[PDB]
Amino acid sequence: AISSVLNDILSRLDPPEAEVQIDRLITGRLQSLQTYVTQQLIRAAEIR
Amino acid sequence: AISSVLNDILSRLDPPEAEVQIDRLITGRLQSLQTYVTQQLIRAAEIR
Amino acid sequence: TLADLICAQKFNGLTVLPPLLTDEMIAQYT
Amino acid sequence: DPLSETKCTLKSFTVEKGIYQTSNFRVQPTESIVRFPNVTNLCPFHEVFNATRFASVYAWNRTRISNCVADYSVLYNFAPFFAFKCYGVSPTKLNDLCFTNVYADSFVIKGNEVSQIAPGQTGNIADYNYKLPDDFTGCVIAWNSNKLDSKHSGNYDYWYRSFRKSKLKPFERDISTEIYQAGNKPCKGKGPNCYFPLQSYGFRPTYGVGHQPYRVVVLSFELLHAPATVCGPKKSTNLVKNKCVNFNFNGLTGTGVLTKSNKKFLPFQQFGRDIVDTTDAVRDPQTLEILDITPCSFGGVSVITPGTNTSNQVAVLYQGVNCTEVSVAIHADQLTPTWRVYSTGSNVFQTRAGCLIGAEYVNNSYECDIPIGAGICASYQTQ
Amino acid sequence: NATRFASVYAWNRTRISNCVADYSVLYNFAPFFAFKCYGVSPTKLNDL
Amino acid sequence: CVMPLFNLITTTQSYTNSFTRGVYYPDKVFRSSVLHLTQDLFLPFFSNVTWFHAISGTNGTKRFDNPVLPFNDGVYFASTEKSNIIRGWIFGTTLDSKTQSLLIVNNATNVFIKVCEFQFCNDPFLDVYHKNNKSWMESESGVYSSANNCTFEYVSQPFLMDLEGKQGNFKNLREFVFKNIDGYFKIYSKHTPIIGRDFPQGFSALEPLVDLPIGINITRFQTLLALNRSYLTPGDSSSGWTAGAADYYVGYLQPRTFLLKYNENGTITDAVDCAL
Amino acid sequence: SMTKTSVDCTMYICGDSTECSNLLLQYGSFCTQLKRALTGIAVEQDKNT
Ligand SMILES: *[C@@H]1O[C@H](CO)[C@@H](O[C@@H]2O[C@H](CO)[C@@H](O)[C@H](O)[C@H]2NC(C)=O)[C@H](O)[C@H]1NC(C)=O
Ligand SMILES: *[C@@H]1O[C@H](CO)[C@@H](O[C@@H]2O[C@H](CO)[C@@H](O)[C@H](O)[C@H]2NC(C)=O)[C@H](O)[C@H]1NC(C)=O
Ligand SMILES: *[C@@H]1O[C@H](CO)[C@@H](O[C@@H]2O[C@H](CO)[C@@H](O)[C@H](O)[C@H]2NC(C)=O)[C@H](O)[C@H]1NC(C)=O
Ligand SMILES: *[C@@H]1O[C@H](CO)[C@@H](O[C@@H]2O[C@H](CO)[C@@H](O)[C@H](O)[C@H]2NC(C)=O)[C@H](O)[C@H]1NC(C)=O
Ligand SMILES: *[C@@H]1O[C@H](CO)[C@@H](O)[C@H](O)[C@H]1NC(C)=O
Ligand SMILES: *[C@@H]1O[C@H](CO)[C@@H](O)[C@H](O)[C@H]1NC(C)=O
Ligand SMILES: *[C@@H]1O[C@H](CO)[C@@H](O)[C@H](O)[C@H]1NC(C)=O
Ligand SMILES: *[C@@H]1O[C@H](CO)[C@@H](O)[C@H](O)[C@H]1NC(C)=O
Ligand SMILES: *[C@@H]1O[C@H](CO)[C@@H](O)[C@H](O)[C@H]1NC(C)=O
Ligand SMILES: *[C@@H]1O[C@H](CO)[C@@H](O)[C@H](O)[C@H]1NC(C)=O
Ligand SMILES: *[C@@H]1O[C@H](CO)[C@@H](O)[C@H](O)[C@H]1NC(C)=O
Ligand SMILES: *[C@@H]1O[C@H](CO)[C@@H](O)[C@H](O)[C@H]1NC(C)=O
After folding, report:
1. Cβ separation of G6 and D300 shorter than 8 Å?
2. In Å, how far from its chain's centre is CA B44?
């Protein structure tokens, strides 16, 4: 995206043009969350 | 992407239009690496 | 030693839940 | 109410006994404050867009715009605009942003050459006269100037570079008059394989619209929220501290509380960032003071219920907050979940798991029934 | 620079092969109303 | 452009080592008690840097060394002097009136910065002279003959630089970093005192001084020395231009990744060169 | 046992923004799955102790 700050994207772009950057950020942060959750599950199995 | 080879994409397209294919390859290979590492972690837990 | 980093983590949706058994209860069990 | 939210989370009309993490509470902002600098003098846009004479395309005039108020409604006064193409920023938002610096690259081209002024474009003007950067951010305004840049006998004052050994790099101006050489034979003058790089436009009023002279101004902005400088025409609002507010510090937009601090900013420093690169402090443009930013309190909301069978009564755990903060937010009506559970005074209890509202604390000790946390449990009992 | 061009519904096909493709010749008689290259950057045609 | 005949000595480019000097602040962001990995144009640790001396000898031969020097991606300039002989710098590709050139000069009352197609002399310099044996003043007549098509002029920084005196050794470790980034001519600086004589071992972060949005092309630079019309060394009756003793080290910036340590105060205290 | 953590998917990805929240609602039940997994981990830690 053009920025890692969501407010900047919402403030500098129209909805149709800001939606692309918002979706890029959504994809990246969703992937980060799933990675963290998967590692947490594996570590929880080890701790169990 | 148009080609799976990084060198061909770089040698056939200008940076503004090559970057899209570069990012497609980057996303695919990042997903492949993440899948490999997750499977490795699960198999290592079994082996442990 | 348990684990600004904590404030920064707590500042974007990441919170830590306290354990159900306090360390006093664990000491009592032991 | 909390019980309906629990039912929706479980997607069932009956709820079993337990504690369910239903939602997340947030404290909403009460006021919105902006802080723009003392500058009041308008930017010299009229001088740039209404100059007596415009430089040639190969010698494009770079005007520096800084330390002024940039009102873009003035640009709409003289708006015969043929092209108003803004890349990276919405034009309608241009009045609400603060730009670090403005570069106005003004020149004159042909009518059909307007489309060449865009990132990634190719052409005579794009490659040999004026090339935009690949990551260009700003706007391009092209408008006809036939009535001012045309002569009956031919206006030859405008010249364009038609031949060059290599394409121009972005933001590169070429003024060399060396004769273009085709091949390996050196050129000592006009002749075969030798052409003058600069060709006169010869704009005339009798020519077609596509050949009429067009004045093009490229306004390039460096959208970084640190040096402030060129801010938009928005009225400043008095600073309020110790309250959850929507702050706008020189285009830096955010939500949170602002507090006086001891973060000893060096004279050149403008804002501070945390370990994880989150804005921790800001500098007030007017009073030149340091302000820690603390986002308004948020957290999880869990609903302790004895089951749909026994009763519809519920308790609410706001995880990881003071009970006084929740009480203050409720009093001013700032909590995001607007289903406030009735609190008597003995219902509010502060656990290390959070603030528990709707459950009465008894100085007894039973086997755990509903695990709240931190050694505290809950149960539906006759009292 | 052919003297006569074929009709659009009977578009003329020319087979260019077994020769060095020096694109600098095209820039000589180049009014160049449109030079749009799809899938390949025009600036890189001199190395491919 | 009038220059009295002197027995000029060919410049000798000595070599010394840079230690860990030349670390500046990468950005305006404040940071507390953190370690930051930043990639920027830094002076590599323990790299070798060039050393020049500007002095007037006792035998009449005066070492007036102001060679034209490359700029590349940036320059680190360390100066040790007592009479402020190093008075400014010039920057440009051709150093003539064909192309715009940048000039930084000490006016002894303010600081002058110009971006104009200056017609510099063969060796531009500032003329410091004593009028009426009462007033010392500096003139720029020896720098350029004329100025035309000026696009930027900046008279500011009313600072006399060294003012505490010459306690340790001139108390004038003047460290500067000049960079060209996105059309911005960036000057960072630090006025370090002296423990020793020359190039003391230690760490000193260079606080930024000024960003000039000149937006010009620079691929070469030169040093400007101060020439005074006699009456500098007591007991010398030689009526002629003389220059005080001064030393200056020049190093070149390279794209390097540095690990910088900010303490709770907000100041860089240490740095690590990731590829040393 | 280890540290029990709770992550708000909406706050983490699309902090206090409604456009981003509406766009994130088009990705299905990923956030609910993450919340369920983290809750299971926390309850498992309490059970372990
Ligand atoms: C190119 O732009 C410069 C800088 O704006 C013009 O020089 C003067 O700039 C000042 C400050 O904005 C204006 O008040 C003057 O009207 C400008 N002109 C003159 C003659 O002083 C310069 O004129 C511009 N050149 C062209 C050909 O447009
Ligand atoms: C809820 O906030 C109150 C008020 O800040 C906290 O109570 C303070 O505790 C400190 C430390 O013991 C005392 O010095 C103050 O006098 C208390 N203030 C008042 C107004 O009584 C309390 O600690 C907070 N709750 C939690 C769980 O930390
Ligand atoms: C398309 O037109 C070209 C000429 O523009 C034709 O190429 C000629 O083909 C003849 C066949 O006998 C050759 O003798 C010539 O040397 C070719 N070149 C020229 C310049 O005349 C080509 O055949 C045409 N293609 C079709 C399918 O009609
Ligand atoms: C960070 O800056 C502060 C403010 O100058 C320094 O605090 C001073 O420290 C000295 C040395 O101990 C004391 O004599 C002063 O009384 C302090 N001033 C105040 C207002 O508390 C602090 O020392 C700096 N940090 C370091 C490591 O030097
Ligand atoms: C533009 O300049 C012309 C010529 O000096 C002048 O007559 C006219 O009023 C100016 N327009 C504006 C809007 O300043
Ligand atoms: C801005 O103006 C206000 C009101 O006059 C004044 O108090 C303040 O000092 C000014 N700030 C600066 C930086 O000049
Ligand atoms: C409550 O649950 C019990 C079983 O635990 C069941 O017999 C009964 O029908 C339920 N409903 C009521 C109203 O008691
Ligand atoms: C192109 O064809 C025209 C018309 O026959 C002719 O006059 C001209 O010389 C030709 N040019 C080349 C380069 O062959
Ligand atoms: C720098 O120059 C010194 C002095 O000659 C030499 O010892 C050293 O090896 C040089 N360093 C490099 C990296 O070339
Ligand atoms: C800057 O000038 C130098 C020296 O003439 C030249 O080689 C270089 O290409 C120029 N850079 C730009 C960006 O025009
Ligand atoms: C230097 O400063 C004086 C005032 O002290 C000022 O009049 C003059 O223009 C400045 N510049 C020179 C002498 O180049
Ligand atoms: C200044 O600009 C004018 C007008 O374009 C030009 O003729 C001249 O060569 C430039 N340079 C100088 C030193 O006057």
Report:
1. yes
2. 24
